[PDB]
Write a protein that binds this ligand. Structure first.
Ligand SMILES: CCCCCCCCCC
Ligand SMILES: CCCCCCCCCC
Length: 1184
C-alpha cells in the first residue's frame, strides 16, 4: 500500500541503516498509528516463503522411503545463507585472540630501564583500535542476518501446518487436543526467532577454547588445567543451584493459580459482593493465601542472587589461582601476567556466557521439529468424489462406526423428491448426514451420489463482516434470487429494521444480532445456493408457530420442492406432508415409509404416536423427549514513575546510602594503589611484595562486585514493594464507584493481575540488580582511569551527553513501535480459533483457497511491523558500539602522550579499559529491557489513582418521594421524581413497561448508580448511616446467586462469629436442615466451582437464610419464577409467611398469577405512578 524504501536502497545505506531517518523523526514529534507503518519487503512474503518449502518437502515425500524429516527438507535450501554468516561469526570472534599480544608490546615498550618508546607506544595502540573496530563491522551484519533468517523460517512453518490443519481425517480430530494445536504456534513467535542467532556457537566455542588453552603458555607448568578446573567448579556450583530451584517452583505454580482462579470468581459477580457489602473478608482471605507465595518467592529470590553473583567473583578467583602457582619458580614478570590475564577472561566468558545458550536451543528446536514431523504424518481428509451425472443417491445395507453407530441402512432415493428422517436424541440423528457429506467414512456397504451437494449445519457461525458476505459467500449478486430468498427466509422485518440494511457490520457472535437472526442467515446460504442435493440438520430450534409454517409453506413448496430435499425435524404436519419418512433405533432401522403404510404395520404405534392432540404448539425439547420416550416405550516513560516506585519502601533508600560509600572508598584505594604501589613492583626484581594486590586492582568487575553483607538486602527490600503495591490496587478497584468501573467490561482488569502483576512480582526485582550492579562497575572503572589522566573528562563528557540523548531518541519511537507487534499478534490466533469451528462447513462450499489466502495477509501485517522494529534496534546498538571506540582510542591516544615522565601507570589504563567492552554492551542491553518493563508498573498506578467513596425502633416503612436517577438509561423508563405511599410491614408488588429496566430500580435503592432525592429510614437519612450501614438493610436474592469455593461455614458466615445452634436453628426455620442432613460433617462440607452440583431451588433458600444471618428490615425479589416449580412454590409461599411477618418485600413480575398474592401493585411509567389495594381498583389498569 505505502511502498517500502528498502526496495529502493543503496548498498551503503542498507548496511548502516540510512532509511529509518524519517520514521525515527515522525515518532519523536507525533504518535504513530497502524496506517503509518508500511509493508514488508518483496523477498519476505509468505506466499514466496511457503511455496518453496512445500516443493522441497514434496521431494522428500515423493521419494517415498524410510521416513521424511523436515530438518533434512529445509537443508535442501536454507544452507546458502546459513553458512555464509557462519564464517563471519568465527572470523569476527577470532580477532579477540590477537588483542593480548599487542597489549604486551606496550608493556614491553615501557619500563624503568630504557627510554619511553613513543612510536610503537602510539602506533601499536592505534593498531589495536583497528582490530577493535574490525570486530564490530564483521559481527554486526551476520548477527542481524540470522534474525532475518529465523523470521523467514517460521513464516513458512506456520503456513505449512495451516495448509494441513484445514484438511485432516475427522476421526482423529476428536483424539487430538485443542491446547496442543494453539500453544505450539503461540509459544514460538518472539522467542524462536531471536533464539536462532546463537546456534552457530556450538562449534565456535570448542574451536576457540582448544585454540586458546593451547595458546596459553607454561604448558610444562600443569596449571592451565587447574585454570580450566576453576571454570569447571564454577559450572558445578551453578548447576547445584538449578536443582535446588525446581522444588520451590512446583510449590509456587500450584499456589498462584488458587488466587488467580478465585479473583476470576470474585470480580465477575462484583455487584452482589457490594450488595451484601463485605470488602473486609475478601482482602484478608487473599492476604492469607498470599503469605506462602511471598515466603516462597523470597526463598527463591535470595537463592538466585548467588547464581548471578558467582560470575562476578569468578574473575579474581580464576586469575589468581592461574598465576600464583607460576609465582613459585620462574621469578616474576609483568608482561608475562598481563597477557595470561587477557587470554583467561576470553575463555572465562565464552564457556559460561553463551555455551549454555547454544546447547539450550538444539534441545528445544529439534524437540519441536519432532512434533511437526508427527503432526504431518497424521491421516488426511479423502477428497470429494462427486464428479458425476449418471444418477442420484441410493444406499444398500450401509454400516458405520465413530455397537456400530449405523447398522445396515437401506434407501433407494429417487430424484427430485421430498424426504424426512427423525428419532431419539441419539439414535443416528446427526451421523447419517455426515456419511452422505463424506465427513465420516462408511465401514462397509455401497453409497454413491452424483453431482454437487449442499449443506446447512446444526450450530451456525458467522464470518465477521457484512451480512451479504455470509449469505452470498463466494458468489455473484443478482436481481430476483437474492430478493425472493431473503423474502422467503423471514428477514423482511430485519430488512427495514436495521440502519445500514444489507451493509450492517457483524462480529464476535450473537451479541449484535439474535440467535433467531443467526439461524435465518445460516439457512440463507443453502437456500441461496444452487446444488443437486440439499441437506439441513435441525434448522428449527426456535418454537415459532408462524415462522415454521410460513417458511415451510412459502419457500419450499413454491421454490425448492422441484428439487430433492432431506430434513430432520419433529412436526406431524411435516411428517404427513413428506413423501418418504424414516425412523431409527440406535443404528438399526425402526421403520421407513408413510402413515397409511404404517397403519398396515404398527396400528398401536400409529394411534399412540398421534395421541397428542395439540402437538404443533409443544416445545421442541419437550416433543423431542416425548418422541424419544414413546418410540422406545412401544418398541511515554517519565521521571516520576521511578520516584513513586522507590517512595514506597524507605529501606530501598536506606540500603542505597552505604552501597555508594563502598564505591568511593574502593575507588580511592585503587587510585592510591595505582599511584603508590607500581614503583616498588619494578624495583622488586631490579619476595612476593605487592603483586597479588596489583592483580586485584586490574579486575574492575570483581573489585566493585556486591557480596552478601553489601548486596543481599536489595533483594529483600524490593520484593516487599510488590507485596504492598498489590494491596493498593486490589483495595482501590474493590472500593470504587460503579460508573467509570462499568465501561471496561472485565476483559482488562483480570489482564493486569494475570500478566502485569506477575512480571513486577517475579521478573523485575532480580532484573533490577543487574542494572544497579553493572552501572557501578562501568562508572567506578572510568573514574579510576580518569583521576590519573585529568584530560579524559573532556573526552568522556560529550560522549555521555550524546549517549543519553541517543537513548531518549530511540525509546520514544521504539516503545510506540513495539506495542504494534503485540497488538498485531492477536488477529493470528483469532483467525485460527474461528476457522476450526466451521471445519465441516468450510469444505462443503469448497472455500479453502479464500481462507488460505486471507490467512497470509494477517501474517504480512505482523512481519512488516516486526521487521521495522528489529532493524531500528540494530541501528541504536551499532551507533552506540562505535561511540565506544572513540572513547577507547581518544583515551589511549592521549594517555601515552601525557605530561608524565613515569609511564608505568599506562599498564593499568589500557588493560583495565579493554575488559569493559563485554560489560558495556551487556549493560546497555538490559537498559532497554528495564525501561520497557517500567511501562508495565505505570498501568497499576493508573488503577490505584481511580476514585473512591444505627438501630431500627421495630420499624420498616419505605416511601421515597422525589427520586430521580442519574444513569440516564433504564429500558426507556428512567426514574424521575418517583414516589409511592406503601405502608410498613406490608408485602408489595411492582410493574411497568415490558422491559423497563427491572434491575435498575433495585440497584438505584442499593446505590450502584448516580441518585437524587433524600432517602430516609422512617426519618433517618444516610447522614448518620454510611454506605455499609445502609447496605445492612436490603435482602437481595437475584437470578444469578453468588457461591464461591470453600465450605458452607465460610459461605454463610464470612466474619465467623455465629454459633452452631444458631446456624442450625435458622436453617430449620428457613427449611434447609433435612435436605442438608444427607451431606457429611454437619455444615463443614466443602463446595467448589460455584456450587453447580447442588440443587437449583435450594440455591435461593441458602441466600434467603443469609438475610436472617445478615439483618432484618427489607427484602427484594428479581423474578424467581424461572427457578421455581409446583412443589417448591408452595413451601416458598408458606414458609415465607411463617418466617417473617415483619420485613417488607418487593416483587417485580410480568405474569398475572403473582398479582393475586400481594397487597398493592405499582403501574409505573416515566413520571407516572399508580396503585390501589382492593381488586376492583388494583386490577382495573392491569386487567386487559
Ligand atoms: C552482504 C555481506 C556484506 C559483508 C560486509 C563485510 C565487510 C568487511 C569489512 C572488513
Ligand atoms: C534514566 C537514567 C538512565 C541512566 C543511564 C546511565 C548510562 C550511563 C552509561 C555510561
Amino acid at each position: 500500500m505505502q511502498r517500502s524504501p528498502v526496495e529502493d536502497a543503496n548498498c551503503l545505506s542498507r548496511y548502516f541503516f540510512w532509511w529509518t531517518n524519517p520514521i525515527m523523526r515522525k515518532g519523536f514529534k507525533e504518535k504513530l498509528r497502524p496506517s503509518d507503518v508500511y509493508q514488508a519487503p518483496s523477498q519476505d512474503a509468505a506466499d514466496i516463503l511457503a511455496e518453496r518449502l512445500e516443493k522441497e518437502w514434496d521431494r522428500e515425500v515423493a521419494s517415498g522411503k524410510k521416513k521424511p524429516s523436515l530438518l533434512r527438507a529445509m537443508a535442501r535450501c536454507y544452507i546458502k545463507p546459513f553458512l555464509l554468516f557462519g564464517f563471519l561469526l568465527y572470523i569476527g570472534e577470532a580477532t579477540k585472540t590477537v588483542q593480548p599480544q599487542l597489549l604486551g608490546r606496550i608493556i614491553a615498550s615501557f619500563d624503568p630501564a630504557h627510554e619511553p618508546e613513543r612510536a610503537n607506544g602510539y602506533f601499536l595502540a592505534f593498531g589495536l583500535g583497528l582490530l577493535f573496530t574490525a570486530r564490530f563491522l564483521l559481527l554486526q551484519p551476520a548477527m542481524f542476518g540470522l534474525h532475518h533468517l529465523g523470521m523467514q523460517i517460521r513464516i513458512a512453518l506456520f503456513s505449512i501446518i495451516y495448509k494441513k490443519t484445514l484438511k485432516l481425517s475427522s476421526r482423529v480430530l476428536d483424539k487430538i487436543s485443542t491446547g496442543q494445536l494453539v500453544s505450539l504456534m503461540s509459544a514460538n513467535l518472539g522467542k524462536f526467532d531471536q533464539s536462532l542467532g546463537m546456534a552457530h556457537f556450538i562449534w565456535i566455542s570448542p574451536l576457540q577454547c582448544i585454540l586458546c588453552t593451547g595458546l596459553i603458555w607454561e604448558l610444562i607448568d600443569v596449571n592451565s588445567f587447574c585454570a580450566l578446573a576453576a571454570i569447571s567448579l564454577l559450572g558445578v556450583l551453578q548447576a547445584f543451584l538449578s536443582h535446588k530451584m525446581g522444588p520451590y517452583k512446583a510449590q509456587k505454580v500450584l499456589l498462584t493459580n488458587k488466587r488467580l482462579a478465585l479473583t476470576s470468581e470474585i470480580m465477575e459477580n462484583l455487584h452482589s459482593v457490594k450488595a451484601y457489602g463485605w470488602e473486609e473478608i475478601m482482602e484478608t482471605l487473599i492476604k492469607n493465601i498470599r503469605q506462602d507465595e511471598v515466603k516462597l518467592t523470597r526463598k527463591i529470590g535470595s537463592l538466585r542472587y548467588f547464581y548471578s553473583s558467582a560470575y562476578f567473583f569468578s574473575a579474581i578467583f580464576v586469575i589468581v589461582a592461574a598465576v600464583v602457582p607460576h609465582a613459585l619458580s620462574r621469578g616474576i614478570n609483568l608482561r608475562r601476567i598481563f597477557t595470561t590475564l587477557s587470554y583467561c577472561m576470553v575463555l572465562r566468558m565464552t564457556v559460561t556466557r553463551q555455551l549454555p545458550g547454544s546447547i539450550q536451543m538444539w534441545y528445544d528446536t529439534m524437540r519441536l521439529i519432532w512434533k511437526i514431523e508427527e503432526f504431518l504424518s497424521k491421516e488426511e481428509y479423502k477428497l470429494m468424489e462427486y464428479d458425476l451425472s449418471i444418477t442420484e443417491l441410493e444406499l444398500q445395507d450401509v454400516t458405520a462406526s465413530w455397537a456400530p453407530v449405523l447398522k445396515d441402512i437401506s434407501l433407494k432415493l429417487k430424484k427430485g423428491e421430498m424426504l424426512a428422517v427423525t428419532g431419539s436424541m441419539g439414535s443416528g440423528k446427526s451421523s447419517l448426514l455426515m456419511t452422505i457429506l463424506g465427513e465420516l467414512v462408511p465401514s462397509s456397504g455401497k453409497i454413491r451420489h452424483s453431482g454437487r451437494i449442499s449443506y446447512s449445519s446444526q450450530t451456525a457461525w458467522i464470518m465477521p463482516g457484512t451480512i451479504r458476505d455470509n449469505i452470498l459467500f463466494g458468489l455473484t449478486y443478482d436481481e430476483y434470487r437474492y430478493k425472493s430468498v431473503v423474502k422467503a427466509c423471514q428477514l423482511e422485518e430485519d430488512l427495514a429494521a436495521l440502519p445500514e440494511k444489507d451493509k450492517t457490520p457483524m462480529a464476535e457472535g450473537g451479541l449484535n444480532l439474535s440467535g433467531g437472526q443467526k439461524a435465518r442467515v445460516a439457512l440463507a446460504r443453502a437456500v441461496y445456493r444452487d446444488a443437486d442435493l440439499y441437506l439441513l440438520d435441525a434448522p428449527f430450534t426456535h418454537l415459532d408457530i408462524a415462522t415454521e409454517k410460513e417458511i415451510f409453506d412459502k419457500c419450499l413448496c413454491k421454490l425448492m420442492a422441484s428439487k430433492t430435499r432431506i430434513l430432520v425435524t419433529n412436526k406431524i404436519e411435516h411428517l404427513k406432508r413428506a413423501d418418504k419418512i424414516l425412523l431409527l433405533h440406535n443404528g438399526e432401522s425402526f421403520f421407513y415409509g408413510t402413515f397409511p403404510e404404517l397403519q398396515s404395520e404398527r396400528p398401536d404405534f400409529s394411534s399412540l404416536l398421534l395421541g397428542l392432540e395439540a402437538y404443533d404448539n409443544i416445545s421442541a425439547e419437550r416433543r423431542c423427549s416425548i418422541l424419544t420416550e414413546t418410540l422406545h416405550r412401544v418398541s511515554t516513560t517519565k521521571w516520576n514513575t521511578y520516584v513513586r516506585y522507590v517512595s514506597n519502601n524507605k529501606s530501598l533508600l536506606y540500603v542505597l546510602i552505604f552501597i555508594l560509600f563502598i564505591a568511593a572508598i574502593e575507588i580511592a584505594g585503587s587510585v592510591a594503589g595505582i599511584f603508590l604501589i607500581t614503583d616498588e613492583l619494578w624495583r622488586e626484581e631490579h619476595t612476593s611484595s605487592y603483586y597479588i594486590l596489583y592483580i586485584y586492582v586490574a579486575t574492575s568487575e570483581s573489585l566493585l562486585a556486591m557480596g552478601f553483607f553489601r548486596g543481599l538486602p536489595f533483594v529483600h527490600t524490593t520484593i516487599t514493594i510488590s507485596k504492598k503495591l498489590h494491596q493498593k490496587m486490589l483495595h482501590a478497584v474493590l472500593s470504587a464507584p460503579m460508573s467509570v468501573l462499568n465501561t471496561m467490561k472485565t476483559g482488562r482488569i483480570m489482564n493486569r493481575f494475570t500478566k502485569d502483576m506477575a512480571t513486577i512480582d517475579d521478573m523485575l526485582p532480580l532484573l533490577m540488580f543487574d542494572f544497579v550492579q553493572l552501572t557501578v562497575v562501568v562508572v567506578g572503572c572510568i573514574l579510576v582511569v580518569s583521576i590519573v589522566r585529568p584530560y579524559i573528562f573532556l573526552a568522556a563528557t560529550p560522549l555521555a551527553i550524546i549517549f543519553i540523548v541517543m537513548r531518549k531518541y530511540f525509546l520514544r519511537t521504539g516503545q510506540q513501535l513495539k506495542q504494534l507487534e503485540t497488538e498485531a499478534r492477536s488477529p493470528i490466533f483469532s483467525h485460527l480459533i474461528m476457522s476450526l469451528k466451521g471445519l465441516w462447513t468450510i469444505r462443503a462450499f469448497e472455500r479453502q483457497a479464500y481462507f488460505e489466502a486471507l490467512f497470509h495477509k494477517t501474517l504480512n501485517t505482523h512481519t512488516a511491523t516486526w521487521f521495522l522494529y528489529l532493524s531500528t534496534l540494530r541501528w541504536f546498538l551499532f551507533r552506540a558500539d562505535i561511540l565506544f571506540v572513540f572513547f577507547f582510542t581518544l583515551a589511549a591516544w592521549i594517555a601515552v602522550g601525557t605530561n608524565q615522565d613515569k609511564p608505568g601507570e599506562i599498564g593499568i589504563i589500557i588493560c583495565l579499559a579493554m575488559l569493559i567492552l563485554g560489560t558495556f554492551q551487556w549493560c546497555v542491553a538490559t537498559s532497554i529491557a528495564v525501561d520497557g518493563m517500567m511501562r508495565s508498573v505505570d498501568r497499576v498506578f493508573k488503577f490505584i489513582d481511580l476514585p473512591s467513596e444505627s438501630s431500627w425502633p421495630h420499624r420498616g416503612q419505605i416511601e421515597v418521594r422525589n427520586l430521580t436517577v442519574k444513569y440516564t438509561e433504564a429500558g426507556h423508563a428512567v426514574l424521575k421524581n418517583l414516589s409511592f405511599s406503601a405502608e410498613g410491614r406490608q408485602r408489595v408488588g411492582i410493574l411497568g413497561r415490558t422491559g423497563s429496566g427491572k434491575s435498575s430500580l433495585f440497584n438505584a435503592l442499593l446505590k450502584l448508580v448516580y441518585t437524587d432525592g433524600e432517602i430516609s429510614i422512617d426519618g433517618v437519612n444516610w447522614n448518620k448511616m454510611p454506605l455499609q450501614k445502609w447496605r445492612k438493610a436490603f435482602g437481595v436474592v437475584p437470578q444469578k446467586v453468588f457461591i464461591f469455593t470453600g465450605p458452607l461455614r465460610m459461605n454463610l458466615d464470612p466474619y465467623g462469629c455465629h454459633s452452631d445452634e444458631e446456624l442450625w436453628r435458622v436453617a430449620e426455620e428457613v427449611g434447609l436442615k433435612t435436605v442438608i442432613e444427607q451431606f457429611p460433617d454437619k455444615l463443614d462440607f466443602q463446595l467448589e466451582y460455584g456450587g453447580y452440583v447442588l440443587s437449583n431451588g435450594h440455591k435461593q433458600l441458602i441466600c434467603l437464610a443469609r438475610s436472617i444471618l445478615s439483618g432484618a428490615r427489607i427484602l427484594l425479589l428479581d423474578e424467581p419464577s424461572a427457578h421455581l416449580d409446583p412443589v417448591t412454590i408452595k413451601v416458598l409461599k408458606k414458609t415465607l409467611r411463617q418466617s417473617f411477618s415483619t420485613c417488607t418485600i418487593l416483587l417485580s413480575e410480568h405474569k398475572v398469577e403473582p398479582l393475586l398474592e400481594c397487597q398493592s401493585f405499582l403501574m409505573m411509567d416515566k413520571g407516572q405512578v399508580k396503585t390501589y389495594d382492593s381488586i376492583q381498583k388494583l386490577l382495573n389498569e392491569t386487567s386487559h
